Amino acid sequence: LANSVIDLIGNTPLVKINNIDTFGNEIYVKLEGSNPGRSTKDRIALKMIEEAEKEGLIDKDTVIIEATSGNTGIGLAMICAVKNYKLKIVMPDTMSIERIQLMRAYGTEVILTDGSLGMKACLEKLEELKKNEKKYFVPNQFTNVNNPKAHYETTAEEILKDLNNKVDVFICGTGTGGSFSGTAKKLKEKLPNIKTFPVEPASSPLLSKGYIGPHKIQGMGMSIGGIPAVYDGSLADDILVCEDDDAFEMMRELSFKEGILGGISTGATFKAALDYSKENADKGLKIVVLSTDSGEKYLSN
Amino acid sequence: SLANSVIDLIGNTPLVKINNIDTFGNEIYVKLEGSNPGRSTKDRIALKMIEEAEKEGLIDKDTVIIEATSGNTGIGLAMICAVKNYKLKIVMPDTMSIERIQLMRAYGTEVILTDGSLGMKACLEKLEELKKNEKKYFVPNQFTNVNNPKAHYETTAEEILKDLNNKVDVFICGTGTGGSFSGTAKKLKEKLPNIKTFPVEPASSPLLSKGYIGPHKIQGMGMSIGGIPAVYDGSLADDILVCEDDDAFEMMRELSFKEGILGGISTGATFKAALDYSKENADKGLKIVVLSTDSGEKYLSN
Ligand SMILES: Cc1ncc(COP(=O)(O)O)c(CN[C@@H](CSC[C@H](N)C(=O)O)C(=O)O)c1O
Ligand SMILES: *N[C@@H](CSC[C@H](N)C(=O)O)C(=O)O
Ligand SMILES: [Ca+2]
Ligand SMILES: [Ca+2]
Ligand SMILES: [Ca+2]
Ligand SMILES: [Ca+2]
Ligand SMILES: [Ca+2]
Ligand SMILES: [Ca+2]
Ligand SMILES: [Ca+2]
Ligand SMILES: [Ca+2]
Ligand SMILES: [Ca+2]
Ligand SMILES: [Ca+2]
Ligand SMILES: [Ca+2]
Ligand SMILES: [Ca+2]
């Protein structure tokens, strides 16, 4: 028995790739779309809220407010439904309408900004929204240690346990950098020889080239006006990238060939991993790819 | 949770207690079949129908799988056929949530549509035409295949028994084929002879309770093949429960608002029928299990 959907967060499956040629290495996909809120962000939503509760920062009528590209808003929305907290989310208009559908299904209010101004514009609008709230809590996934700490405590430990401490490579898409950084931190503490790589959009190559641009790999990319504090670049063994169309194409390869329905970033992260496997062919590596969310919310895309 | 393929994620779904919505002094647990990798309970029947036909020698590498579905059986078949590399053709009514066609095509399915006004009967009739154009095929036929109710008899029911440590007073399940109701209820009544088991049908298509059909919006539920499906076993029904379209939508919304459970329209219908039952039997401490057939994401566009 689960006492609520909160008890279903985490413990997500790790699935082997069987039909796609992975070049003499084994690739496993950790399916964070299996979380009740359908993304890895259920983990950080829960930890940011639960630690804030313990620190006395959240009363029953505290309005939670967060800037998000969608999934952190959804995770927060589901958790706030269970906890009976009021949530307001600021997000860009460029993101999939299904993200909005999902947040509103849980009773969350959504405020929209111009997506051509990036997540920076979301954060600016959030400052305006604070002025009208008597009592609020901003989790701030861009700075909150409990974003990467969630992954350090659960996501990484699950990877280690399911693969019996035999993991050679971990590859993960980045937006805040929290899932990459928290998970890689724990993996590296337990497995000193593991290689860990972040992925970013080829069209928004901030970490690899020093500049941003518009891209279509929803959830990935860094658009707050700098590298987020929760991204730990020292963990990156190299920066991997993926083009927009290649990410969409790989999303369909995974669903057609493996029955894995992941999001656009899953396509991006998996393409990057498969390219890595190919460059490192026939080594017998155990490679883990984080799939951040499920593909159902991208059918309109 | 290391899996060899997504097929290994089918089943072992969670039972969640209802905490925030008033349940009138009985305990209601929802079995979340939306946790399946294909997002519905139909993954269980897709797997068993395919695996049994494989063992029978009815599916070779080049056998085309052909099925009539309202969506979820097609999605479950599509996901499994993607892993197994079988060619799948699905016939569905054009009146269902348009996420269904997209989901199915994402897995490689060929989707053929029939006039929704004609119901599933039109889908089944269209299969006759598809069969003439194929050298090798297998039709799972969820409406007649005993491996539909047997999948639930074998897995769904056992998980309910295990998770509640054989303490189950009432089981309430929505119907379309009637397979999830009938297979689960059969097992439960074998192990617990005092358990009450109830199917739910749409109030505006009350075939079982009033002997006629009509239009309804509770996608996946209702019986529109031109009679009661062979896999429905009405001898298991302690009563027939119903739900109106508006109440099903209202309760779908209340579940997501108050419990963070995003179930489909039929989950709203089944849960509403369960709440009505629990109110009629208020404060008896009954342990009531409601099967949530699918998750709600595919309905949120309308
Ligand atoms: C979302 C949803 N809820 C309930 C059901 C009913 O489950 P059982 O079939 O009774 O185990 C379904 C099943 N959907 C089937 C079609 S059932 C027949 C049609 N409703 C009809 O004759 O009109 C499917 O996915 O094909 C379901 O999907
Ligand atoms: N996936 C996150 C957002 S990460 C940062 C964003 N991609 C950016 O452009 O800065 C979420 O909010 O769900
Ligand atoms: Ca306080
Ligand atoms: Ca609310
Ligand atoms: Ca160490
Ligand atoms: Ca190193
Ligand atoms: Ca390209
Ligand atoms: Ca199994
Ligand atoms: Ca009471
Ligand atoms: Ca045999
Ligand atoms: Ca195929
Ligand atoms: Ca095909
Ligand atoms: Ca009514
Ligand atoms: Ca809608």
In chain A, domain spans: 1-41+144-301, 42-143
Q: Which of A2, A11, A107 sits opposite B257 (nearest CB)?
A: A107
Task: Let me know if A186 is exposed, middle or buried by CB neighbors in 10 A (0-12, 13-18, 19+).
Answer: buried
Which residues partner with A65 through β-bridges?
A88
Q: Is B282 on the interface with A (CB under 8 A)?
A: no
Between CA A115 and CA A258 the distance in angstroms is 33
Which positions in chain A touch B253 (Cβ < 8 Å)?
105
Angle B200-A3-A31 (CA atoms, 0-180°, nearest 5)?
A: 85
Give bridge partners of residue A195 from the DSSP assignment: A169
Residues 102-121 of B with CB under 8 A from A: 102-103, 106-108
Cβ contact, residue pair B2, A8, below 8 Å: no
Name the β-bridge partners of B40.
Answer: B294
**Alpha-carbon gap, residue B80 to A152, rounded angstroms:** 33
Shortest CA gap B208–chain A (Å): 32
Output the residue whose Cα is nearest ligand 2's atom 12.
A68
Q: What is the assigned CATH class of domain B1-42+145-302?
A: alpha beta
What 3-state class would DSSP assign to B125? helix
Question: In this structure, which residue's CA is closest to atom 13 in ligand 1?
Answer: B220
Give how far Cα A10 sits from Cα of A13, A35, B100, Å: 9, 6, 27
DSSP B220: T
Query: What is the spatial distance between Cα A156 and Cα A227, in angstroms, rounded to a whole number?
Result: 23
Look up the CATH number of domain A42-143: 3.40.50.1100
Q: Which CATH number fits domain B43-144: 3.20.20.70, 3.40.50.1100, 3.40.1360.10, 3.40.50.10440?
A: 3.40.50.1100
Please list every residue in chain A whose beta carbon sits closer than 8 Å to the beta carbon of residue B80: 259
Q: Does B42 contact chain A (CB < 8 Å)? A: no
Query: Would an 8 Å CB–CB cutoff place A300 in contact with chain B?
Result: yes
A59-63 contact pairs (CB < 8 A, 24+): A59/A135, A60/A84, A60/A85, A61/A86, A61/A135, A62/A86, A62/A135, A62/A136, A62/A137, A63/A87, A63/A88, A63/A133, A63/A135, A63/A136, A63/A137
Q: How was this structure determined?
A: X-ray
- Provide the 3-class DSSP secondary structure of residue A179: helix
CA-nearest residue for atom 6, ligand 2, is: A175
Which among A26, A32, A27 is positioned nearest to A8, based on CA atoms? A32
Q: Nearest by CB to A299, which of B6, B103, B253? A: B103
Which ligand number lies closest to the CA of residue A257?
11
Radius of gyration of chain B (CA): 18
Check the annotation: does A223 bind a ligand. no
CA dist B107 and B220 (Å) reads 20
B260 touches chain A (CB under 8 A): yes
Using alpha carbons only, give the angle B260, B261, B263 rounded to the nearest 5 degrees. 145
DSSP state of A234: G
Distance, in angstroms, between B87 CA and closest chain A CA?
A: 11
Give the resolution value in Å.
Answer: 1.8
What are the tokens at A57?
A: 């920062």
Answer yes or no: same fold for B1-42+145-302 and B43-144.
yes
Q: Whole-angstrom Cα distance, residue A66 to residue A16?
A: 35
CATH number of A1-41+144-301: 3.40.50.1100
